[PDB]
Design a protein around this ligand. Structure first.
Ligand SMILES: N[C@@H](Cc1cc(I)c(Oc2cc(I)c(O)c(I)c2)c(I)c1)C(=O)O
Ligand SMILES: N[C@@H](Cc1cc(I)c(Oc2cc(I)c(O)c(I)c2)c(I)c1)C(=O)O
Lengths: 116, 118, 116, 118
């Protein structure tokens, strides 16, 4: 749909599968409120988290439980989890892909905003 | 110091100067408590946030305002900020070096933990 | 096919399209010899560069002309180009995806080796 | 010095110690000429490769043997090495800091160029 997540493992060089992803929308009260969640698939992807009709402009936060994932491989991670806060103001493009590359002591995240 | 931050700019090939950094500590009520703040210097570093005595066990959050940095450069970035959450000094004290590499639609962070020997 | 390349732009947050990619195979003489080439598509991907029958074990080098790409956006790049040398010993998995994330002064590359 | 390398380990949260680095310069015949070599120290840094006089205009290649590093750690990595190709001091001399962040199936590199004022 209009919001996709992709997670990869930099240690094994494979998609990070079955990771818990939680999405939040900043509400007026300025707190974070549940929006959507899921666990990444076998190809380290999470789709159809939302629809265009309910994905309105605003501030969203995507939180990835990197800790649980690393513990499970029996590796001691640094981060409690990874977060990505961005303003989604679909004024042009439509699709957003939040990609994160994980390592026990580091993680990189990039956003690919396209139109088709 | 126990806590050090290093920020680099991937578009210019330079350290990230005047980037504001806010550090919080997860309060006793699962509330985030301001713990320290600063701005990266000419070398994109920030030392002097805290001391050994002040820096006790707990979950800390280092928030880097990447947004203000880019905006003041003519580029509108994707992210609002960059935040690193971690548990510190649970096995006696350590030295943490939180490093970030910035790009308008991406950023990378890694941590360097060294044992003072305590 | 069994070798895929993906390129992304970290400055515009979009796929890096129409980038020249050249692949080499280290020959006995130990020099690099032409193997395959292409320009990334509209989604910053390059597929069907080879086939299983001709992708044999050995040392391959994937070179991405990051310079030409950055010059075209009128940005001064640091690197002359990005390279990725790896040993492909399909003894297990089959597919290799060489992903590279570009920035005028930096580039990260990760490999996703899967089986389906 | 004009040329400095910094290597970090993303799996351990530490500098990359004893990593071999070879530097080449594109010879007059489009041949790579060995220019300097070293090994990262306890702080995952390598200084003293060259001098201002020695380091003239040209295209250089910094090759980091990431493979030997990982192997000597029990992990078999994806890449054979990590190489950074760039043109240096074409607009009078500069100072270059080639930094790499290593992972078994990934690695990141960025450069920090500063003007000595020449
Ligand atoms: N006192 C040091 C400060 C410094 C610490 C680190 I640790 C570092 O290394 C990286 C490597 C990568 I890859 C990054 O993305 C990032 I951010 C930092 C660099 I350069 C500089 C000095 O100024 O000499
Ligand atoms: N089904 C989606 C899945 C997908 C998105 C991305 I974006 C991607 O590319 C990278 C490149 C680097 I470098 C990373 O560190 C990471 I994480 C992902 C890859 I492979 C796959 C699609 O193909 O559109």
């Amino acid at each position: 749909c209009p919001l996709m997540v992709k997670v990869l493992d930099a240690v094994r060089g494979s998609p990070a599968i079955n990771v818990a992803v939680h999405v939040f929308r900043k509400a007026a009260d300025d707190t974070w409120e549940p929006f959507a969640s899921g666990k990444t698939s076998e190809s380290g992807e999470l789709h159809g988290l939302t629809t265009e009709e309910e994905f309105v402009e605003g501030i969203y936060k995507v939180e990835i439980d990197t800790k649980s994932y690393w513990k499970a491989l029996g590796i001691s991670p640094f981060h409690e989890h990874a977060e990505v806060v961005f303003t989604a103001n679909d004024s042009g493009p439509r699709r957003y892909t939040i990609a994160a590359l994980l390592s026990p002591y580091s993680y990189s995240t990039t956003a690919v905003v396209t139109n088709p």
